Amino acid sequence: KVKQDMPPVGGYGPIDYKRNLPRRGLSGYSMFAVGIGALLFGYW
Amino acid sequence: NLTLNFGHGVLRLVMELSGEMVRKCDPHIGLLHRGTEKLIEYKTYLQALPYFDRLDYVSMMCNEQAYSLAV
Amino acid sequence: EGYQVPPGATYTAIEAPKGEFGVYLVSDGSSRPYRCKIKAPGFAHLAGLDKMSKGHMLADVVAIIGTQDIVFGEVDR
Amino acid sequence: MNLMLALLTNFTLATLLVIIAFWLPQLNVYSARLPFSMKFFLVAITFLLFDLEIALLLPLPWASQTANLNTMLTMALFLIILLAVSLAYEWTQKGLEWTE
Amino acid sequence: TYKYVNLREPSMDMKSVTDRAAQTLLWTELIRGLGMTLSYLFREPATINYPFEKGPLSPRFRGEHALRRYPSGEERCIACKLCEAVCPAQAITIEAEPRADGSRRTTRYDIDMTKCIYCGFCQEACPVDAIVEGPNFEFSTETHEELLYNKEKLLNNGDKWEAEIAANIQADYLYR
Amino acid sequence: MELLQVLKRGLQQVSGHGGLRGYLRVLFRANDVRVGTLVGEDKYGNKYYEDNKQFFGRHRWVIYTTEMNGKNTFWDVDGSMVPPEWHRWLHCMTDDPPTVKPPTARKFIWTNHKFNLSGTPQQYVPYSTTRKKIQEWVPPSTPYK
Amino acid sequence: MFMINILMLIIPILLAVAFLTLVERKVLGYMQLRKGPNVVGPYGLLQPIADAIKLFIKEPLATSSASMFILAPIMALGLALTMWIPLPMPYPLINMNLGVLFMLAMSSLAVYSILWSGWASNSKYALIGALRAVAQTISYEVTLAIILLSVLLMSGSFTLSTLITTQEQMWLILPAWPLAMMWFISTLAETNRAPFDLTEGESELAGPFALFFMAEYANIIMMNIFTAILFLGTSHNPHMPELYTINFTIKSLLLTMSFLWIRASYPRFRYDQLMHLLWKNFLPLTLALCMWHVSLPILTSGIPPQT
Amino acid sequence: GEYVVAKLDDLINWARRSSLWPMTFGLACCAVEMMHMAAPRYDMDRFGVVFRASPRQSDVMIVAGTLTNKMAPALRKVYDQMPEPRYVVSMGSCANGGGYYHYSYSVVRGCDRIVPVDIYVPGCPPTAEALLYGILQLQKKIKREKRLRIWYRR
Ligand SMILES: CCCCCCCCCCCCCCCCCC(=O)OC[C@H](COP(=O)(O)OCCN)OC(=O)CCCCCCCCCCCCCCCCC
Ligand SMILES: CCCCCCCCCCCCO[C@@H]1O[C@H](CO)[C@@H](O[C@H]2O[C@H](CO)[C@@H](O)[C@H](O)[C@H]2O)[C@H](O)[C@H]1O
Ligand SMILES: CCCCCCCCCCCCO[C@@H]1O[C@H](CO)[C@@H](O[C@H]2O[C@H](CO)[C@@H](O)[C@H](O)[C@H]2O)[C@H](O)[C@H]1O
Ligand SMILES: N=C(N)NC(=N)NCCc1ccc(I)c(Cl)c1
Ligand code: SF4
Ligand code: SF4
Ligand code: SF4
């Protein structure tokens, strides 16, 4: 029987390609609140 | 205007600068000219194929494909 | 000897990674090409470096050469 | 004496390292104006003028110990604001641009 | 079909503007870049311990040339000169005459390894599997002349490497 | 704690190389103190190891012999010291070692592998292998003008 | 006794610089999915020694003025070692009442080695590269001096060991993290470190070389030691001073390692862009924060003691 | 006398071969396999071979690609500015002897017409591993040097 390189019956599984840059961190408000909070404690 | 004689392969750039700004860029190439096109005229069509690997030598098999399609 | 190619001329191009790469290949009927002009996309791109670099600074010339994707194997041939 | 000794040691050692760096066995028997750019001159001059204002601010940690804090705070802020005005003037007169 | 890489409108509400202000002043995206290089610091490196470890190759690898024998010890090459004709670099030079027993054999078989482009056309062209590119790639020299192989050098390569060459041909000849 | 199991894994490599001296010997000869499974040894003394839990490319390695063909190779090892039968395995050209799939024997195959001989009196020197093409006339050996 | 003390500072500084080159190469390597030096001695521990010997037996390859060609490296290395003598670790070699001013004064002299070597290069293009480097260095001197003054308005004096007392309860990075951020970046730009390594950048677009390299890498360590003292004050126990030295060394090592981390992470600034970062961003904020830190102790009644 | 000269030679040889800083002339495709030798798999830096050195700080010139006539003067100029001891590694068929372009009107038939060459690395291109073998061969050549022993016997 002919035997050559072929994909598996049913094909291969899905391959990702789309950009995936997950969102992380806090909002600008929260970040500024943490920074101002640190300064106030430091000043005190 | 200061003249800078020098500023993938090797390139010679001759530039005219006005402070930080580039006013002229004159690329001087041919530092990797190897007369490939003339050499191909002394080769059979198969013997010429490996010359195309060595053109855009980052995209070897695409250069091969272009030549193969043409032939 | 190699295979004989019927006489004629073709311009054949592909979308290579660096742009349009083509050959103008002239056959005289024999087993050796009569003329093979190689159209390298970086050739025209580098010819446009002077135009693209107008009004920019020295360090930007590096970025512009990089954005053009230049290999001198195909530019110089 | 200690600081003089330290300085003499540091630079004396630096001299010696340069010496041997230039002379080791080798084993062989055989005033114009420099393409003057005005922008770099103005950076140096601007640094100088700001450096002189910094000289005036350096006493501030000691000045805060005064009982005349009303006067001292007003003059400290006045000096820094005038420094900011200097920067603002240079900025709006294209003195911080590197084009052209 | 096409897509736009860079055609988006920033949201101009106060929350979004303040988000961009925080990124500008607190360097958030720059810190996010520091996280990537930090995560690579703690990954196993990809380096192999050459020459104790070697990069993987395949039976098709085109390395140093060799001239092969039949099992009896007779040379396979019969001086047909097909390899010399196909060589894109003209790296091969052959002379032949009748041997003392009448066999058609070469008296010269040179490969200029500094002209050769290691393309493998010679071993494709050969009708008797005489000239092959073997698996060896660690044969750099101190002088140019050592890379100008004559027939004795190439026969010695074949005798030196035949054990590996035969096994590699055994693995790939059904693709040829 | 995990850091504990890592530390004992480091200690096992010392005893896995036959004590401190063997451990330091491999550290300085090969800059690698991993312990693998001995796949085999060739007639020159090179030993071949495998560990299939390592990533592809590091799963096979050779500890070169300290002496080959009259050359001291304790420090001066060379990739060309691997004989051809082990060359196929070490480069992953095949899966099975010559101890399991020995090469076919031929009377003309070198019984003694040679490493790179460049820069030595054994180096190859090129020459023309063909005989003289034109025979010159030899004058007679008796006077007769 | 004092000469022994000087040598127990000079010698370790040079050895620390030597092995920072190894640490830099290996840290960069692992962030690049590779190893860096690991053949020349175990884990590359002999690599700095091989490099050092190699450079010093290399051919020492005409100067436009011999006196300045030799002065520039002596100045660089001599000044670099001098910046260490007032550092409290926890006790300074020399206890200066104005140690902070001394470091500011000595660091301002370091730009002469750049200027003199550009003059001695005998090349129009090397002199221009030196002048560009000088303009960068003096530009970032401005914010460094103003940031330092702002911090000292919480400390009360120019004595470096007083920064230890000021941070007995809390690191100064908490009340002054906006200044810490600009201070840290300013040190990178001040030492021509990436992404501010424009001398090595713009340039490519033996013993004397080694000497300049040692001076620069000594300055890198010193600047991060200064940063640790300025913003991450270690607590001093007079009966166990080695406890201070261990904790303070770890902070300085980590700060130095973050210089390497940053080199591995970002592209380079354009020259005009790093000038705008200073004159249009850092300097405005530094000036505003200088006014703020003048007012804050007064308005909170938190003025520190003069002594 | 003999013992000191021999040990000192071993020391300077070890330092020079353990800290080989290359100037790479990336002329053509062979330069790509040189980049792969610097890449993580082979990591030439781990041998003390820094990625890219300045020509005036360099100890070995790697000619990685075709040397054209137009380029030949520039390559010689860089070689002459190198501080000694300096070595040259010729990489690939083009630099070794012209290679595929040996018969071209515009190509130098081997960089050894322009500069002396210490090591010839064959291949078109040599694999990154082949080039690394060549660099290690150069290290062994440096280990064989006896400069001080010969100096002592003058
Ligand atoms: C209640 C009263 C309160 C009163 C006080 C209030 C003050 C606090 C609130 C304000 C916060 C101030 C923050 C100060 C930090 C400096 C901010 C800054 O200058 O960033 C702007 C600068 C340029 O930004 P750019 O996007 O290029 O363009 C803007 C102009 N066109 O962008 C940059 O500077 C980028 C820096 C480039 C360098 C990159 C390498 C560094 C990345 C790693 C940094 C790690 C953090 C350092 C930590 C140091 C620890 C010691
Ligand atoms: C371009 C020119 C710019 C010039 C800028 C000048 C800005 C000056 C702004 C603040 C000046 C005064 O700032 C502050 O005001 C309060 C007003 O109660 C003063 O008063 C406060 O301190 C004094 C002490 O002297 C106390 O007696 C008083 O009970 C207290 O309220 C402060 O002493 C002064 O420090
Ligand atoms: C940090 C302490 C290190 C202590 C090491 C002590 C070792 C002392 C012996 C050093 C021997 C140096 O060996 C020698 O160095 C010089 C450096 O220019 C080299 O170069 C020298 O010789 C070449 C010709 O050969 C000349 O063209 C060149 O001008 C000259 O500089 C030599 O090629 C090398 O043979
Ligand atoms: N930039 C790096 N980290 N690597 C690097 N090649 N540094 C330079 C190497 C060097 C220079 C002087 C000395 I003294 C020493 Cl011991 C080493
Ligand atoms: S591999 Fe190609 S270039 Fe080399 S000898 Fe064979 S046919 Fe000629
Ligand atoms: S090696 Fe093969 S192709 Fe070449 S001459 Fe001999 S038999 Fe013919
Ligand atoms: S030897 Fe081969 S790979 Fe190298 S530059 Fe020449 S053609 Fe390209």
CA–CA dist H92, H112 (Å, integer): 13
Structure-determination technique: cryo-EM
Q: Which of H10, H137, H143 to mutate to test the interface with F (most CBs of F within 10 A)?
A: H137
Q: Are H95 and H65 in contact (CB under 8 A)?
A: yes
Chains that contact B by 3+ CB pairs under 8 Å? C, D, E, G, H
Question: How many of the other CB atoms lie within 10 Å of CB of G204?
Answer: 9
Whose CA is closest to C2, among B68, E109, E82, B39?
A: E82
Residue H114 DSSP one-character state: T
CA–CA dist E157, E74 (Å, integer): 15
Q: Give the distance from residue D21's alpha carbon to the nearest chain G alpha carbon, in angstroms.
A: 4
Give domain status of residue D97, yes or no. no
Backbone angles phi, psi at B17, to 5 degrees: -115, 135
- Chain F residues with CB-CB distance to E163 below 8 A: 84-85, 103-104, 106, 109
- State this model's resolution in angstroms: 2.3
Backbone angles phi, psi at G260, to 5 degrees: -65, -45
Q: Give the distance from residue B12's alpha carbon to the nearest chain E alpha carbon, in angstroms.
A: 28
Q: Give the distance from residue H46's alpha carbon to the nearest chain C alpha carbon, in angstroms.
A: 29
Query: End-to-end CA distance of chain C, in Å?
Result: 26
Q: Are H37 and H44 in contact (CB under 8 A)?
A: yes
Inter-chain contact E55–H41, Cβ cutoff 8 Å?
yes
CA–centroid distance for E142 within its chain: 21
Q: Are D56 and D43 in contact (CB under 8 A)?
A: no
Amino acid at B42: Y
Residue B5 DSSP one-character state: S
Say if residue H129 is exposed, middle or buried (CB neighbours under 10 Å; 0-12, 13-18, 19+).
Answer: buried
Pairing of strands H119-121, H87-91: parallel
Q: Residue D64, SS3?
A: coil
How many structural domains are present in chain D?
1
Give domain status of residue D99, yes or no. no
Q: Are F69 and F112 in contact (CB under 8 A)?
A: yes
Ligand 4 atom 10: residue of nearest CA:
G51
Q: Which helix (H) or strand (E) holds C51?
A: helix C49-52
Q: Which helix (H) or strand (E) holds H24?
A: strand H22-26
Tokens of E40: 């690579």
Tokens of E23: 């990124």
Give domain status of residue D98, yes or no. no
Phi-psi region of A8 (alpha: psi -120 to 50; beta: other; left: phi over 0): beta
Query: Distance of CA G62 to CAs G69, G122, G153, Å?
Result: 10, 7, 50
Question: How many of the other CB atoms lie within 10 Å of CB of G298?
Answer: 16
Let me know if chains E and D touch, i.e. at least 3 Cβ pairs under 8 angstroms: no
Backbone angles phi, psi at B28, to 5 degrees: -110, 110
Ligand 6 atom 3: residue of nearest CA:
E126
Q: Which helix (H) or strand (E) holds C62?
A: helix C58-68
CATH code, domain carrying D12: 1.20.58.1610
Q: Are E92 and E40 in contact (CB under 8 A)?
A: no
Whose CA is closest to F86, among F41, F125, F119, F124?
A: F41
CA–CA dist G76, G7 (Å, integer): 19
What is the residue range of D41's domain?
7-92
Q: Which of G23, G28, G31 to mutate to test the interface with E (most CBs of E within 10 A)?
A: G31
Tokens of E57: 């190759």
Tokens of G142: 């401005």
Give domain status of residue D45, yes or no. yes
Give domain status of residue D23, yes or no. yes
Give domain status of residue D54, yes or no. yes
Q: Residue H64, SS3?
A: strand
Inter-chain contact E51–F77, Cβ cutoff 8 Å?
yes
Three-state secondary structure string covering chain G: CHHHHHHHHHHHHHHHHHHHHHHHHHHHHHHCCCCCCCCCCHHHCCHHHHHHHHHHCCCCCCCCCHHHHHHHHHHHHHHHHHCCCCCCCCCCCCCCCCHHHHHHHHHHHCHHHHHHHHHHCCCHHHHHHHHHHHHHHHHHHHHHHHHHHHHHHHHCCCCHHHHHHHCCCCCCCCCCHHHHHHHHHHHHHHCCCCCCCHHHHHHHCCHHHHHHHHHHHHHHHHHHHHHHHHHCCCCCCCCCHHHHHHHHHHHHHHHHHHHHHHHCCCCCCCHHHHHHHHHHHHHHHHHHHHHHHHHHHHHHCCCCCCC
HSE toward the beta carbon, residue D98, CA cutoff 13 A: 22
